[PDB]
């Protein structure tokens, strides 16, 4: 039920891809992920299926057939303290890219040209793990944004999350047209004594 999370007027960026926000409320889903991460302000535009740079190709990679939504709101107190918060690291350069939906917690030194880098730093070897400059005294583009990306997938397994949107109310005793879950017909509706299992 994503209808109550759209008109709340509490998110700075509530966009989707492929599936419309007003259509995924009455549609089943096999499994929904929860990719939560805190980035800067200029990196929000790079979180899109089909982008490149130094963040989407080295940290979080989005699939080409991504049919989900991107939830992002403004914040400066739940992830940035006074004096500068340098607790969120990120990878800037690496020897290879990252496939979509893949995590990496290793720590290696990037190799630029010669001087193979394996446990030794200095010349031709730089530390890729930097740090964001989340400070409340900076501008607007340097403000942190807690982006929560939701992934939608469909497999052959029966989906446990399901349910259509609200419909017209009930009437009884009158001759009426009716439609129950797509069962279109005409008749009189009443209570019944019937002992349905």
């Amino acid at each position, epitope marked *: 039920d994503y209808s109550v999370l759209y008109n709340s007027a509490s998110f700075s960026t509530f966009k989707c891809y492929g599936v419309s926000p007003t259509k995924l409320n009455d549609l089943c889903f096999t499994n929904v992920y929860a990719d939560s991460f805190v980035i800067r302000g200029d990196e929000v535009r790079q979180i899109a299926p089909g982008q490149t740079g*130094n963040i989407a190709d080295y940290n979080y990679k989005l699939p080409d057939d991504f049919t989900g939504c991107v939830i992002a709101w403004n914040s400066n107190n739940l992830d940035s303290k006074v004096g500068g918060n340098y607790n969120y690291l990120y990878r*800037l*350069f690496r020897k290879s890219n990252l496939k979509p939906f893949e995590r990496d917690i290793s720590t290696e030194i990037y*190799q*630029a*040209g*010669s*001087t*193979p880098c*394996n*446990g030794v730093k*200095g*010349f*031709n070897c*730089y530390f890729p793990l930097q740090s964001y400059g989340f400070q409340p005294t900076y501008g607007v583009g340097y403000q942190p944004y807690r982006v929560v990306v939701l992934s939608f997938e469909l497999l052959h397994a029966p989906a446990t999350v399901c349910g259509p949107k609200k419909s017209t109310n009930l009437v009884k005793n009158k001759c009426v047209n009716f439609n129950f879950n797509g069962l279109t017909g005409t008749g009189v509706l009443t209570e019944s004594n019937k002992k349905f299992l």
Partner: antibody
Amino acid sequence: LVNPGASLKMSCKTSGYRFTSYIIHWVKQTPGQGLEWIGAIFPENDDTSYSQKFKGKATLTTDTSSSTAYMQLSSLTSEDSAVYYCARDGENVLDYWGQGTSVTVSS
Amino acid sequence: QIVLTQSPSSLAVSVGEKVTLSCKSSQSLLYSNNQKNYLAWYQQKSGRSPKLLLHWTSTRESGVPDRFTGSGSGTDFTLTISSVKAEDLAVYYCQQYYTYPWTFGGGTKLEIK
């Protein structure tokens, strides 16, 4: 033509190849002597690498939009005059080691 | 700051004659982690850009004849040329690839007898 103590800037652009290299190199060779390495440059964070012999006389600046490496030479001397060659370094060589420009130093 | 010593000063080679030139490094240029020797061989024809002939001393350059073959063990590095031609004559140099600062210890003119 640069007088002793003048500042000289040399720029070279790779031709047929678009970036795709993690190092750039500068070499000074006087005629009748072997090539001597000067400095190495990195495309992202500046390498700022200088040889101990050339340290304090050479400055390395790279501009992505320009697509050409920049080398600044200071305190030029008669010994300093030599042919300097723009070069690079990827896996091995990929038409990255370019040609050289002769330097003459006199008042 | 490992200086590299390369000898001899001059190489006299006839056309179609195999020749061996050796460059010696003060410290071993083999990285312990990969157990691979690091060195570069360069050709320097007159009025020409410095050109890499052999890399790592184990891999030939693309579009390079099999006549140029180099084998290096530990400190000693050896490059062997065969079927030498007038176009082939050039100054030959050994460049350390093991660690900064880079040192060009290359140094061998090639002449035809």
